[PDB]
Amino acid sequence: PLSRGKKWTEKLARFQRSSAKKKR
Known part of the structure; x- marks a missing residue:
């Protein structure tokens, strides 16, 4: 999980x- x-x-x-919202 958080390892x-x-x-x-x-x-x-x-x-x-930068890519999180490639179509925003």
Whole structure:
């Protein structure tokens, strides 16, 4: 589950946007 450190995803949840909203 969090053996990944998704707390980081928070940053991508904010930066991954680059592709997170490929059709926004």
